[PDB]
């Protein structure tokens, strides 16, 4: 997606050298730079998208889809990891009962 | 169709002897207060429809149909 | 990717829009330069909206794609007739399934019907069957005695009714339900667990309330529906469906129910002194249990609960509510379930 | 549409409302367009000056609504206030972007011409009336009839037509000019007036009969 | 309310520092809304016994906490309801409630509208209702322009 | 009421038949015909002009004897004048519909002459008042902006109008005319609450005035300044307020107190894990904006507290209680809640 392209054949789409100012080509780059950062901001969603890459307050409604709630001043990077061994908790039998006890140390 | 002044009905299978659908699909229609006929289905072309609507005559059902 | 209002977007756009002349700087609402930035920005604004709302639903999407806990649809609703004969039985007569039921009554003109034969004994007067609604919602919740007649010849049958109303008519899940049921889930891969009991013994859609009480050597499950009523297929399904969530070394079972009875009074001061007639006083007795009967074994009654749940109508209009009789909260037993009995509500 | 009239020495708005509508009856509600007091027409100057917005004497222009819209209550409102403005709102409103008026007749069937200016203040150039019609036929004559990304089939194939300079080519741009004059509804038809080719260059001019 | 009920709901919501650049807005009540709003305070009305639709817009200013994090903004909010639920009503039926609205009454609308708006998309939280919100502004100018036109014209 | 021309015209024919027995010939073109035509058009004429005084009349004529201006979409004009190089020496003429185009580009507006003016043989300046074409407010326009001429001459200089054009003029609906009135006749009420409450408005730095009534005294207070009221304005309102008091009736004018609450509350959350220190925050802070959102004169129930409190989330929070809150607080009139010291625990 490109103002420039499939806007229209006669619009003059580059500033006129013989004036400096040109209010057409200045009301363009404008309208170009906006869609231009909103595609940007598009494209930057794609880490949003998905929980390995999730920050702020995606990840934090990832974590309550999960139901692992945030803890109080604590990162990204390891917050997804704590999710990841939630989801994947090992408990029920005694050795892991008692290898649980790493998390209640 | 009017379901409001229509109360519950006990409509027998046997109304017409040896009767047709048609004949008994004439009976639950209880014309002319309502329509019924076959048409094509515009909303989903290649098939048909069965059509069983209260009567147009209404103004605001008459406004509801589509203008040609 | 943040959110953004119009304001902000269309003062930044303005400020671009200026760099290299000054033969713009007029922005009343009477140019047509200013409204069309206007409807530019609302446009943008409109599209992060959208988007995040997307991706909202698109994380919701992977969540059912990935474990296939798919939402629950429409439920359908059911409960239980009386039959009443003329005189008692004689012979051992026959009931087929799908045999309809029909209310005579106008404003509840929904059908339904059963799924299961039933034979009534000889000698018999009365048999009780149970009846789906063909319909699924909030229309299948009807008043108590609202079947009537049998819509069919019933030659053998004078009258039916229904002494109990019907609660398991419910709509499609909310957000909010498939997030907690989710997160159950989520903290049920540990079997062996009480938390992993209650998503085993919850994955059946028809349950509703649901506790598990454990004590040294044996684990016990209770359960209800919405109405209220243990039924033997119901068990019978639990126990065919629990399998895969059990404890291998212990005995479990699944029964016991009981419902609980208590008398609410409450005193309410509303703020008008005017319109203090017994139908404020009929509309707020049916809230109140409305409110109760929607309580499940696992929850208990509260004193602070009961009045948030009643002073969900505005607080301009009632000013006060206190209670003579209750004073301290309640604490169910884990077989029984606390519900409305016979409630009076007084202005004073 | 209306058509315009003008007052005439020691007329009365009877005859005025005869002459177009046929019957005098008519003129009760053709007061109320023209939003005039009593004195609807009034010879002395002096005695509009009291009023002069609400009332009309000799030289001064009328509405005269057809028929159609003389009985409508929301034409009755427009036409008593906009006046003048009726012709514009009826020719529409476009933003101008006739910045360079020179350059662009130097640059037939040549993308990058056209461009938005500034007048007033602070705003953008807009056209109205008349000279909004000639700009949107010039757009529409320069620009090819299969360019646009959206509602195609909009322009002309006078970039494909130059040729030997021949007659018959010549008439085959006269008909392409006046099947793009003649594609607006608003316009009613169009003719050659004088047709002229000498050397290199073609020359010619068009006359069209643009409604009201 | 003479011809047909109204949820209760919406009867219940009805009867009851920041500053934008562009805007400034003003707490003139509509001369419609001054009568209309007295009748929803009495009991003389039709109601139902029951409620649906949740995705109307009043459900989403009730779920949130707009009541209690700005009451100001939740006071203009009741406000805009109360003139934009008695346009609908005066098309619909009982056409007697004409000439009591005028354009200014209306413009100063869209400007607590817009007002609200700006401080509803500081937070994350207001995005479905800036989202409908959003969409009436465009539809009072529409009345605004056509409001005079139909006045002379009833 | 009025009647169309055909009625008038029968009636004339029916008594000229029933009068005149030498005129028996009605076709068109007759002179008599012709005269009756004409007579019954001017009394149709005469007939819409008495309909017209009659609709300006029921529209506005009975409110203009009241103090209020009608506007009427007049045009905008004022006095131009114009200079020459050199004394005339001739009758120059001047004739209507000259356009005074606006020297400024970046106005566009323009104004014309109705009338005809005729210079003298000798005079160097004369002046002329020019209407412009342009209604509403928009017409108005700055001093020293007219500064040409579309008919131009050698002997003209230069075009200035010393006075600012004022009489720019906008008409507004009859709804916005009758409101005002509406207004005015409202505003006259006195001795009544809320004729005394708008009384107050009226003055400057009077907002949020409440009014205690009772048979024995008249009390008012307010916190109109900044959450204050001072002295002076005590002073100036007490003054004001004599017009609106009742007669015989004691008038008192106090200022406003307030009564901070300590409370220490406790919550119970479902999830435990959910907890820390932006929820319990939060949770503080919504606690002490309910309270300062207090209206005057407001006793704080503890149930309105809990119900506040708990629908932040139904689910999330299971159980309350306030450890230093017995019962509800009763406030006098005159006081108003505030957060004094607001303490959460949660559990």
């Known amino acids: 997606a490109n103002f420039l392209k499939n806007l229209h054949p006669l619009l003059r789409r580059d500033r006129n050298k013989k004036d400096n100012q040109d209010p057409n080509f200045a009301l363009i780059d404008a309208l170009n730079e906006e869609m231009n950062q909103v595609e940007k901001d598009a494209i930057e969603s794609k880490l949003q998208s998905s929980l390995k890459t999730s920050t702020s307050e995606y990840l934090d409604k990832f974590g309550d889809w999960f139901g692992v709630y945030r803890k109080t001043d604590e990162k990204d990077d390891v917050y997804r990891a704590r999710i990841i061994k939630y989801l994947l908790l090992k408990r029920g039998t005694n050795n892991a009962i008692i290898d649980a006890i790493k998390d209640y140390l | ?68 | 990717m943040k959110t953004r209002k119009l304001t902000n977007i269309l003062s930044k756009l303005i400020d671009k829009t200026m760099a290299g002349t000054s033969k713009i700087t007029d922005f009343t609402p009477g140019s047509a330069s200013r409204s069309l930035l206007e409807a530019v920005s609302l446009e943008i604004e409109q599209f992060y909206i959208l988007t995040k709302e997307n991706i909202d639903w698109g994380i919701q999407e992977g969540i059912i794609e990935a474990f296939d806990f798919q939402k629950r649809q429409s439920k359908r609703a059911y409960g239980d007739v009386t039959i009443q004969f003329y005189q008692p039985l004689d012979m051992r007569m026959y009931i087929p399934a799908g045999t309809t039921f029909t209310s005579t009554r106008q404003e509840y003109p929904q059908q339904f019907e059963t799924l299961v034969d039933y034979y009534a004994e000889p000698d018999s007067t009365e048999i009780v069957v149970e009846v789906y609604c063909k319909e699924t919602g909030v229309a299948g919740n009807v008043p108590e005695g609202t079947i009537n007649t049998i819509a069919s010849g019933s030659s053998l049958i004078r009258s039916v009714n229904n002494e109990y109303s019907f609660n398991t008519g419910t709509k499609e899940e909310s957000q909010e339900d498939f997030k907690r049921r989710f997160h159950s889930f989520v903290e049920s891969r540990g079997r062996a667990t009480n938390k992993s009991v209650r998503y085993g013994a919850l994955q059946i859609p028809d349950v509703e309330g649901v506790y598990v009480y454990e004590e040294t050597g044996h684990i016990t499950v209770f359960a209800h529906d919405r109405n209220g009523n243990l039924s033997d297929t119901l068990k019978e399904d639990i126990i065919d469906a629990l399998q895969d969530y059990r404890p291998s070394g212990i005995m479990l079972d699944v029964t016991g129910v009981e419902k609980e009875e208590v008398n609410v009074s409450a005193t309410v001061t509303i703020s008008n002194k005017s319109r203090i007639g017994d139908t404020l006083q009929k509309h707020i007795e049916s809230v109140i249990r409305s409110y109760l009967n929607n309580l499940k074994t696992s929850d208990d009654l509260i004193i602070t609960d009961l009045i948030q749940a009643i002073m969900n109508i505005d607080d301009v209009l009632i000013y006060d509510v206190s209670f003579d009789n209750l004073d301290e909260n309640i604490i169910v037993p884990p077989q029984g379930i606390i519900r409305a009995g016979e409630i009076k509500v007084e202005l004073k | 549409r209306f058509k315009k009239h003008v007052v005439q020495h020691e007329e009365t708005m009877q005859a005025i409302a005869q002459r177009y509508y046929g019957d005098v009856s008519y003129w009760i509600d053709l007061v109320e367009h023209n939003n005039l007091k009593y004195p609807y027409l009034v010879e002395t100057d002096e005695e509009k000056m009291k009023d002069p917005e609400r009332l009309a004497s000799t030289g001064d222009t009328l509405i005269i609504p057809i028929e159609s819209d003389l009985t409508d209550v929301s034409a009755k409102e427009i036409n008593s206030r906009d006046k003048d403005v009726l012709v514009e709102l009826a020719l529409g409103r476009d933003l101008n972007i006739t910045a360079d008026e020179k350059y662009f007749n130097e640059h037939g069937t040549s993308d990058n011409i056209l461009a938005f200016s500034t007048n007033g203040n602070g705003d953008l150039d807009t056209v109205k009336g008349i000279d909004n019609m000639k700009q949107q036929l010039q757009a529409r004559l320069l620009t090819p009839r299969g360019s646009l990304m959206l509602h195609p089939n909009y322009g002309s194939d006078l970039h494909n037509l130059f040729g030997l300079n021949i007659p018959e080519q010549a008439t085959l741009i006269e008909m392409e000019v006046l099947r793009t004059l003649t594609s607006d509804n608003r316009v009613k038809s169009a003719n050659l007036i004088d047709w002229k080719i000498q050397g290199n260059v073609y020359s010619g001019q068009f006359s069209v009969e643009i409604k009201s | 309310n003479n011809f047909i009920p109204q949820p209760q709901g919406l009867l219940r919501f009805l009867n009851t520092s920041f500053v934008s650049k562009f805007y400034t807005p003003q707490l003139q009540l509509s001369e419609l809304a001054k009568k209309v709003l007295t009748n929803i305070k009495t009991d003389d009305i039709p109601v139902l016994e029951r409620e649906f639709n949740d995705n109307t817009i009043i459900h989403k200013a009730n779920d949130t906490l707009l009541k209690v994090q700005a009451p100001r903004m939740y006071m203009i909010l009741q406000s805009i309801v109360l003139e934009a639920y008695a346009i609908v009503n005066c098309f619909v039926e009982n056409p007697s409630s004409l000439k009591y609205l005028t354009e200014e009454d209306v413009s100063i609308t869209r400007e607590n509208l817009n007002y609200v708006a700006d401080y509803l998309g500081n937070y994350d939280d207001y995005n479905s209702v800036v989202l409908d919100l959003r969409d009436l502004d465009l539809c009072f100018s529409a009345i605004e322009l056509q409001l005079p036109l139909i006045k002379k014209e009833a």
């Open chain 2, 1 to 68: 169709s009017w379901d409001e002044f229509e109360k519950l009905t006990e409509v027998s299978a046997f109304t017409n002897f040896d009767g047709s659908l048609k004949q008994l699909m004439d009976m639950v229609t209880a014309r002319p207060f309502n329509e019924l006929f076959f048409k094509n289905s515009e909303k989903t072309p290649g098939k048909a429809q069965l059509v069983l609507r209260k009567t147009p005559f209404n103004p605001t059902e008459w406004r509801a149909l589509d203008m040609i």
